[PDB]
């Protein structure tokens, strides 16, 4: 075989690209799409296609633009340019408006420099916008705007915006703004970071600062002060451009005040109801208030009796957070996943007055989502297909029989495609089926009425022929029984695979609590590399602490991070030298987040087991790390919960045994995430002892170093290291 | 050959100890000095001794003791506890003091916890203390305190303390108090720090420390808002304990207040005179001002006509700062160490009321120091003997005749030591002499009278036996000669030398302004252990820029830092594979702090030469480091002065040429000298390019990396990295 082989470079100057079918419907047959730079506009049910806007209209602008969103009308533009990156999600951009009609761009009333978040209202061209710190309402996209709050300040009160902690671990959003569907009401969260300790660092910057910089960010680590939460509403069209606005408190129920709350979610029932989510400091109660409007007093009442109250007896609520609830149109019900007495997460059906719920779907095996909602029909993702967890397919369920279930993308294309993903157009006519492995992404457009298949969208074929030249690694997906219990692991193989002699292997890891690293997925990526070219078997594997597999498995780790998921991942280990092609030798392991400090606990445990690994930006000890998610599974630090095994779990404890082993820890130095301080005292703890290891810093870069020339970088160092351990050319 | 060789061990574990003859002269003819753990005070004529404090004095204190101070009056014993580390030379202690008569510690009127400092006067039991930034005079060691001075202010106003710059770059010291021989005045400079940018960075500290804590450093960087400085005496005869006492402020002269200025010394000439010196911003123009006391008014005027200057035109005023000079005891006259027509540093007899001053030595060498001065003689040390820049004795010139020298350490035991220093007793009747190369330390007392050797104090025949037990190394130390003139090198060359092999090579760096690498001291460290076990050359070059043999050397690199050190450095490398005893495959190149610097701009060169190099804490771009010291090299970073080549100069501007060399960059994150920035800088740039190679971080170590853990741990460290680019198992 004279084929080259996915080399290094492949992955990294980046040379086989996955072709996507990005979408944004804006209606219930169209969609809009990009081809080259122009966006296209397309009819779901013929094809049919038209220019909205050329790669042209903004030549003469003289800003670069980044993004774009479309008013609920059709009607007007916006244009995100400026962006200046955050966190995760966080980020500050300029933006214009463009009236579609006119062909015109508005000078008069801008929407100011710094913006931190705007979003249109649902129906209409009202906008609603953040900017230092307040909310902001335009009526029309060229009139003063409405200055809803005041309260606004820097690190201090975010109105209309998520802080940190509440960004992350919470809302995955910086928005904290939500429009009533009719887009009349406008709720926001107001945030207060007054107590909360800030965590410090240095940022170098560009060569011509002279002085670093310390940036400060409100940060609650494990048992310090969180952030308070308040909550308002605000009738937009009763604004008075003399009388300031009066914004309506909906204070949380009476048993989340005793103590530290979290607002964990905010869904809209119908114009003139809303339903909030509430979840205590002790992550294992949490619940859901419907506030009613009331006509005559210009109040919105939350009755008592309409709460339903989520708790978990073995474990914390929701996978990571509380599931979101879904409305049937009148609003008197709604249909939310929700963890069985088994212990497997289904649908049930809420009636909003009374207190138990029916579970309409069951079985050993989870649901993912909820996707869309008719008068018919719920439709949702699910593991179930072949008892797979790895999988995921799409369902529909008869709300007139919930025994009549059609699965909908299974028998599509099945030795292709094994796991899919949804969007539905506005009111549910049609949906784009994304599948995105074992084969090469596929991507199909469907009419809901029949669930005829229209056509293909996007297939790579010009993908597949040039992969043909390459020898590719194939992927194998399979289970182990451990106490009587079947936990799936992947591995990565070589080309040309020979069961009869002995690869080398690195164990890829993540393990945080509900991850799932052994699935269905076709990835292109430095796993590839490292089969396709150097011949290293590349696994990973799903042990306790999972996700998808019910409570069972997921729960075995409450309160003991780093215990069964660290031990799982040596037992994986060992089971594969016991199969025979396995280098018992030449074991290594990996991972980057959470993934680096399994990887670091795992070579601290002196298994003789690992030869060398990497960790990259590890937590180090669960108490440098923020409050909301190490909580969330280890209780508060103090000596009457868990301060015990807080202490019992730290990389740092588990210094001498590295004595045994090779060890590359990096880390970013403006990892707002996981601070650099986590490796600090890794690597302070490890010269304490006389340990040689390898570090390697990587100035200015975040929790991904994310950035161009780092990534290649790091994909580069890593294999260096990667390919001395094991005696490679 | 069967014997064991200098292993890395042995270096790190500190194995082979050179003992010390460590003595504080007391008095004209006593000394102290310790063994094991108690006192013993000598006499210099016969050598016999006595307990004076024993090793069990203080069993029953409960504080383990640091330090101790004795009264110029025998009367106190000062007892420094509660030892904090700060800078290179300040720190924080507690103290108390011990009767000596009555056998009694003090309990009424306590010196403070925290105290910056303290000192005894000069004649009889005065103290006097800085705590919390402010002076104080204790008369008798348990009466109150009076306080000199309110205006102490953290971080801000310094009362008799330095601050960071003038610790490290000017005074070389904490200590910022000058008493009067008498013991009536108390001189103390002020610091102002208002407007000086502070240095940030992150201290993670003990695992216990949740938040890493930001240390703040006013610390001026070039071109950045200097401290100011203010200059007072104090009668501590007339100090009451109802009125403040009354300083008097000594201004700078008028050609030193049109600008910026630095103190750069202060010395006490009689009773009722002090000289001053002043240097300019622009550091080739220094001014000294001696200042009489006033009977009739209270006041110390400083006479235009007493005024010297010393300037150049070729460089910067001093070696790093202008000459000490040194008085006859009526105070008329001094002499002092200042560079010559020539540009050779000599002794110059300065009368105080007249222009020009007298060179009483001269020739094609350098005075190093005046250390005594009696009636008859003045004491130097100079490199005068075999025309050896490298080597050090001791000399002797006739006051009534300048012609007639004799040299007093020459001929003293020729092939053992050729680099002496001295401790002269209180009126220079005896002189501890310290050799310390090229053979084993030698310390021996003699008589001022006659120049007799009245006994050896200690010899090291201990270690010696032992060391002819091991497979020591050689030292060469020889000259080669470039562009007509003579530059010196020294090879650390490894045992049983067979100048037919072809060996491996080391090139050792520093060749910062007016360093010296190549000299004839013997030093057991890093190098010996490459040579001993690893059989690597370990040479160490002065070329351009560097000290001890006059201006047209050491000023060649004026405002051209970065350019001929280090081009002489690679010329260096060359002439040594010309050798032909040198593996021109395997040459490599280190240093630490400004030698971090010189290593990396030579891998950065791209003159194919270097195979490998380590810099540690390297200087990156000259802006990043202190202003006075900068600046005295290099100008001010302004497009008018010599912006352009502060710019030409970087390491980072030279990261593409690293492509060609193996590279290892260390920094500890707590350096508050060369801040960690400065390498955080030379990473960036270098995964900016593509680049591979080396890194590791020494949290909360500084400058030294000091701690023992972080010691070993990095000259292991190196020692791996620099086996790997050689081949050796
Ligand atoms: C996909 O392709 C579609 C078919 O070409 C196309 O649908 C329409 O295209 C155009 C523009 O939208 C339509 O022309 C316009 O139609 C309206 C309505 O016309 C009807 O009504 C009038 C009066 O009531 C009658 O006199 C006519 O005979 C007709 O029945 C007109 O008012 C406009 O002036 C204009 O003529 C066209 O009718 C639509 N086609 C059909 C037959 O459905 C989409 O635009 C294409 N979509 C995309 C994604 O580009
Ligand atoms: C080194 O060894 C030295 C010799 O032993 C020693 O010098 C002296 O030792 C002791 C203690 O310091 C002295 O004893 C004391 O001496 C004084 C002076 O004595 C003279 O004067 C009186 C009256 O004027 C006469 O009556 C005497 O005869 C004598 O001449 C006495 O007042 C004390 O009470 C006491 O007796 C001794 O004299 C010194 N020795 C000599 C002869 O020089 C050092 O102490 C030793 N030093 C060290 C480093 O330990
Ligand atoms: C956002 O920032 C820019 C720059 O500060 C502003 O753009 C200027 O706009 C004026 C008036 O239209 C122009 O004449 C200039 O060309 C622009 N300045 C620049 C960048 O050169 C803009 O006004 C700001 N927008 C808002 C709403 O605050
Ligand atoms: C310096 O610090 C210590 C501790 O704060 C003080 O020591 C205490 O002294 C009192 C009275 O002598 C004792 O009873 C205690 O035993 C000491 N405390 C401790 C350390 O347990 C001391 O007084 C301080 N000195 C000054 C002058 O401020
Ligand atoms: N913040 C942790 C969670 N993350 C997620 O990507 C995630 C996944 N599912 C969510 C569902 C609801 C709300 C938020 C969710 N966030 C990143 C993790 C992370 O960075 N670390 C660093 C060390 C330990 C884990
Ligand atoms: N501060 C620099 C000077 N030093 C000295 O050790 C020294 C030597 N002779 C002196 C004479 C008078 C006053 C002060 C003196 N200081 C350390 C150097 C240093 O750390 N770096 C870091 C990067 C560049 C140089
Ligand atoms: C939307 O619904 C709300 C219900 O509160 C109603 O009061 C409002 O007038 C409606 N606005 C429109 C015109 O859609
Ligand atoms: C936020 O919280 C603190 C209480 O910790 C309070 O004093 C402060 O006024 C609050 N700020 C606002 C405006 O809500
Ligand atoms: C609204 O509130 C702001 C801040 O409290 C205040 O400055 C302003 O006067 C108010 N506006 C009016 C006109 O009522
Ligand atoms: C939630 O967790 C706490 C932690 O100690 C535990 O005491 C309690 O049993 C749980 N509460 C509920 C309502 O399940
Ligand atoms: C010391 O000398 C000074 C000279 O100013 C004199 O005034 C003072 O009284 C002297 N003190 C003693 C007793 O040594
Ligand atoms: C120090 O300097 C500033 C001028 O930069 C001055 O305003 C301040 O008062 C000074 N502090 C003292 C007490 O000398
Ligand atoms: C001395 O000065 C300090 C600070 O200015 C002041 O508080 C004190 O009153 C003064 N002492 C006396 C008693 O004159
Ligand atoms: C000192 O250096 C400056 C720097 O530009 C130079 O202009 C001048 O010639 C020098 N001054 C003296 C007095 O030598």
Same mark, same amino acid.
């Given at each position: 075989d004279?084929?080259?082989?996915?080399?290094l470079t492949?992955?990294?100057?980046?040379?086989?690209?996955?072709?996507?079918?990005?979408?944004?419907?804006?209606?219930?047959?169209?969609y809009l799409?990009?081809?080259?730079?122009?966006?296209?506009?397309?009819?779901?049910?013929?094809?049919?296609?038209?220019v909205?806007?050329?790669?042209?209209?903004?030549?003469?602008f003289?800003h670069?633009i980044?993004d774009?969103?479309?008013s609920?009308?059709?009607?007007?533009?916006?244009?995100?340019?400026?962006?200046?990156?955050?966190?995760?999600?966080?980020?500050?951009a300029?933006?214009?408006?463009?009236?579609?009609?006119?062909?015109?761009?508005?000078?008069?009333?801008?929407?100011?420099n710094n913006?931190?978040?705007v979003? =249109? $209202? %649902?129906? !209409?061209?009202? &906008? @609603? #916008?953040?900017?230092? /710190? +307040?909310?902001? *309402?335009?009526?029309?996209?060229?009139?003063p705007?409405?200055?809803?709050?005041?309260?606004?300040?820097?690190?201090?009160?975010?109105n209309?915006?998520?802080?940190?902690?509440?960004?992350?671990?919470v809302?995955?959003?910086?928005?904290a703004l939500? =429009? $009533? %569907?009719? !887009?009349?009401? &406008? @709720? #926001?969260?107001?945030? /207060? +970071?007054?107590? *909360?300790?800030?965590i410090?660092?240095?940022?170098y910057?560009?060569?011509?600062?002279?002085?670093?910089?310390?940036?400060?960010?409100?940060?609650?680590?494990?048992?310090?002060?969180?952030?308070?939460?308040?909550?308002?509403?605000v009738?937009?069209?009763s604004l008075?451009?003399?009388?300031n606005?009066?914004?309506?408190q909906?204070?949380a129920?009476?048993s989340?005040?005793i103590?530290?709350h979290?607002?964990?979610?905010?869904?809209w029932?119908?114009?003139?109801?809303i339903?909030?989510?509430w979840?205590?400091?002790?992550?294992?109660?949490?619940?859901?208030?419907?506030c009613?409007?009331?006509?005559?007093?210009?109040?919105?009442?939350?009755?008592?009796?309409?709460?339903?109250?989520?708790?978990?007896?073995?474990?914390?609520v929701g996978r990571?957070?509380?599931?979101?609830p879904?409305?049937?149109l009148d609003?008197?019900?709604?249909y939310?996943?929700?963890?069985?007495?088994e212990?497997?997460?289904?649908?049930?059906?809420?009636?909003?007055?009374?207190?138990?719920?029916?579970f309409?779907?069951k079985?050993?095996?989870?649901?993912?989502?909820?996707?869309?909602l008719?008068?018919?029909?719920?439709?949702?993702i699910?593991?179930?297909?072949?008892?797979?967890?790895?999988?995921?397919?799409?369902?529909?369920?008869?709300?007139?029989?919930?025994?009549?279930?059609?699965?909908?993308?299974c028998?599509?294309?099945?030795?292709?495609?094994?796991?899919?993903?949804?969007?539905?157009?506005?009111?549910?006519?049609?949906?784009?089926?994304?599948c995105?492995?074992?084969?090469?992404?596929?991507?199909?457009?469907?009419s809901?009425?029949?669930?005829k298949?229209?056509?293909?969208?996007?297939?790579?074929?010009?993908?597949?022929?040039?992969?043909?030249?390459?020898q590719?690694?194939?992927?194998?997906?399979?289970?182990i029984?451990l106490?009587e219990?079947?936990?799936?692991?992947?591995?990565?193989?070589?080309?040309?695979?020979?069961?009869s002699?002995?690869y080398?292997l690195?164990?890829?890891?993540y393990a945080?609590?509900?991850?799932?690293?052994?699935?269905?997925?076709?990835?292109?990526?430095?796993?590839?590399?490292?089969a396709?070219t150097?011949?290293?078997?590349?696994?990973s594997?799903?042990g306790?602490?999972?996700?998808?597999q019910?409570?069972?498995?997921?729960?075995?780790?409450?309160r003991?991070?780093?215990?069964?998921?660290?031990?799982?991942?040596?037992?994986?280990?060992?089971?594969?030298?016991?199969?025979?092609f396995?280098?018992?030798?030449?074991?290594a392991?990996?991972?980057?987040?959470?993934?680096?400090?399994?990887?670091?606990?795992?070579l601290?445990?002196?298994?003789?087991?690992?030869?060398?690994?990497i960790?990259?930006?590890?937590?180090?000890?669960?108490?440098?790390?923020?409050?909301?998610?190490?909580?969330?599974?280890?209780?508060?630090?103090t000596?009457?919960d868990?301060?015990?095994?807080?202490?019992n779990?730290?990389?740092?404890?588990?210094?001498?045994?590295?004595?045994?082993?090779?060890?590359?820890?990096?880390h970013?130095?403006?990892?707002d995430?996981?601070?650099?301080?986590?490796?600090?005292?890794?690597?302070?703890?490890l010269?304490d002892?006389?340990?040689?290891?390898?570090?390697?810093?990587?100035?200015?870069?975040?929790?991904?170093?994310?950035?161009?020339?780092a990534?290649?970088?790091?994909?580069?160092?890593?294999?260096?290291?990667?390919?001395?351990?094991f005696?490679?050319?």
């Open positions: 004279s084929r080259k082989t996915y080399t492949d992955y990294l100057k980046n040379t086989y690209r996955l072709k996507l079918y990005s979408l944004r419907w804006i209606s219930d047959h169209e799409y990009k081809q080259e730079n122009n966006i296209l506009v397309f009819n779901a049910e013929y094809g049919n296609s038209s909205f806007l050329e790669n042209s209209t903004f030549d003469e003289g670069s980044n774009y969103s479309i609920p009308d059709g009607q007007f533009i916006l244009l995100e340019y400026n962006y200046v990156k955050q966190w995760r999600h966080s980020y500050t300029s933006y214009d408006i463009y009236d579609l009609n006119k062909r015109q761009l508005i000078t008069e009333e801008r929407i100011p913006t931190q978040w979003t =249109w $209202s %649902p129906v !209409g061209h009202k &906008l @609603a #916008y953040v900017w230092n /710190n +307040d909310i902001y *309402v335009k009526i029309e996209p060229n009139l705007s409405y200055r809803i709050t005041w309260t606004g300040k820097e690190d201090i009160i975010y209309g915006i998520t802080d940190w902690v509440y960004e992350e671990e809302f995955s959003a910086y928005s939500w =429009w $009533s %569907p009719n !887009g009349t009401f &406008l @709720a #926001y969260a107001q945030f /207060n +970071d007054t107590e *909360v300790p800030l410090e660092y240095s940022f910057s560009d060569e011509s600062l002279q002085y670093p910089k310390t940036v400060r960010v409100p940060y609650p680590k494990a048992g310090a002060v969180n952030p308070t939460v308040k909550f308002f509403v009738n937009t069209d008075s451009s003399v009388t606005a009066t914004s309506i909906i204070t129920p009476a989340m005040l103590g530290d979290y607002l964990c979610d905010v869904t029932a119908t114009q003139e109801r339903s909030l989510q979840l205590r400091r002790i992550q294992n109660y949490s619940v859901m208030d419907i009613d409007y009331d006509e005559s007093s210009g109040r919105w009442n939350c009755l008592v009796a309409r709460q339903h109250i989520e708790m978990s007896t073995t474990g914390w990571f957070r509380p599931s979101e879904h409305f049937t609003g008197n019900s709604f939310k996943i929700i963890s069985n007495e212990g497997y997460r289904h649908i049930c059906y809420f009636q909003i007055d009374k207190k138990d719920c029916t309409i779907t079985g050993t095996w989870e649901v993912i989502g909820i996707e869309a008719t008068s018919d029909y719920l439709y949702y699910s593991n179930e297909y072949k008892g797979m967890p790895g999988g995921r397919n799409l369902y529909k369920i008869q709300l007139s029989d919930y025994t009549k279930v059609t699965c909908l993308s028998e599509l294309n099945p030795e292709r495609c094994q796991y899919y993903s949804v969007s539905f157009s506005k009111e549910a006519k049609y949906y784009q089926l994304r995105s492995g074992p084969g090469l992404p596929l991507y199909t457009l469907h809901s009425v029949n669930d298949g229209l056509r293909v969208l996007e297939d790579n074929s010009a993908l597949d022929k040039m992969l043909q030249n390459v590719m690694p194939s992927k194998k997906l399979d289970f029984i106490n219990t079947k936990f799936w692991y992947q591995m990565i193989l070589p080309p040309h695979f020979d069961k002699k002995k080398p690195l164990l890829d890891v945080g609590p509900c991850s799932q690293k052994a699935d269905t997925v076709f990835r292109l990526n430095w796993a590839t590399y490292l396709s150097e011949n290293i078997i590349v696994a594997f799903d306790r602490g999972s996700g998808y019910g409570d069972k498995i997921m729960h075995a780790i409450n003991r991070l780093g215990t069964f998921e660290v031990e799982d991942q040596i037992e994986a280990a060992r089971q594969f030298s016991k199969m025979g396995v280098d018992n030798k030449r074991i392991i990996w991972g980057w987040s959470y993934g680096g400090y399994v990887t670091s606990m795992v601290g445990s002196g298994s003789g087991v690992f030869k060398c690994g960790a990259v930006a590890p937590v180090s000890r669960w108490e440098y790390y923020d409050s909301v998610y190490t909580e969330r599974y280890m209780g508060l630090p000596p009457e868990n301060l015990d095994h807080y202490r779990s730290t990389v740092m404890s588990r210094a001498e045994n590295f004595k045994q082993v090779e060890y590359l820890l990096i970013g130095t403006a990892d995430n996981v601070h650099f301080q986590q490796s600090a005292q890794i690597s302070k703890a010269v002892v006389g340990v040689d290891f390898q570090a390697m810093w990587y100035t200015d870069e975040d929790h991904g170093i994310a950035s161009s020339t990534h290649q970088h790091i994909y580069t160092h890593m294999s260096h290291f990667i390919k001395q351990c005696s490679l050319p």
